């Protein structure tokens with residue numbers, strides 16, 4: 001039987017990713033609510049997240065398969081509560097780094113949220129039940145942003161009370177996380193009867209190239225998903241004009257989900273398609289970041305974020321569909337854990353070079369040209385593959 005754990009897990013997802021303060025965070029921490037300058041949020045505060053998503057990845061995943069997936073989801077709920085309490089009632093550059101630390105632990109426990117399904121659902125309904133739950137998170141986000149923007153452009157509700165709605169939502173998410181069914185078996189440690197198995201893990205080359213491209217694409221997308229709000233703030237300030245970040249980010253998540261659904265029905269020969277369409281949409285992403293660095297009208301930057309998130313979600317759903325062909329249940333999660341680790345090492349190196357203060361200390365103007373060049377180098381590796 002699988003109805004009730006699916007219901008409790010989907011309620012946790014739909015009230016966990018229902019954060020209306022998530023689009024309007026950079027007009028919040030740069031407005032009169034918290035006196036933090038843009039250089040501080042760009043260079044001294046946000047990179048901590050990437051740091052706190054590397055160091056907190058490898059233990060938490062091992063805490064994921066050891067205490068059977070429940071106290072790490074309860075830890076995600078407590079992390080939600082502490083993070084949005086510190087966003088509501090924290091002032092100073094000390095506190096916002098602590099916000100980024102607990103939110104890195106949130107994003108680390110997100111994989112533990114997506115890995116809960118394979119412990120209480122029977123192996124008949126692995127594809128169906130998970131096929132609902134992830135969609136619920138997107139359904140929590142898009143409408144979760146619309147309830148943001150339709151409460152800002154129509155009611156003049158404060159950003160503080162937008163964060164208050166976020167805190168109440170993650171509190172409901174934590175109260176649904178307390179009534180979770182404690183499962184019985186894990187996937188690796190408490191599985192019913194791996195150093196020497198590693199050659200058995202990586203006895204391929206197709207997995208290697210799709211995993212390396214997944215790693216670079218995930219690092220680039222996480223960096224752009226960090227700093228696109230600071231780019232939106234720099235192209236048009238929040239105090240000057242009534243910016244529409246919630247509606248654009250909701251439409252962007254919607255277009256990404258529809259693009260992934262379109263990837264799910266591609267009846268094209270893969271050896272005939274993947275040599276061209278991958279390169280074409282990589283050039284589309286590179287041109288999107290080139291557009292967001294070059295322009296001055298903020299509407300061109302909104303269109304750039306729309307096209308970038310949609311084309312990325314297309315390419316990364318192609319990546320997941322290629323990687324998940326021959327893998328088992330354990331192989332899928334193990335290989336994606338190691339690839340997420342490689343992606344966060346690459347993202348941490350690129351953040352230490354570019355974004356962070358003791359480094360190049362580049363502002364948000366130079367950064368998006370650097371990330372357009374990053375996706376262009378990925379497309380150049382694909383072009384050299386097209387020579388091969």
Ligand SMILES: Cc1ncc(CO)c(CN)c1O
Pocket residue numbers: 022025046049100103225226227229
């Ligand atoms: C809480 C939080 N902090 C920082 C960032 C990076 O801008 C994000 C965006 N994922 C976020 O949700």
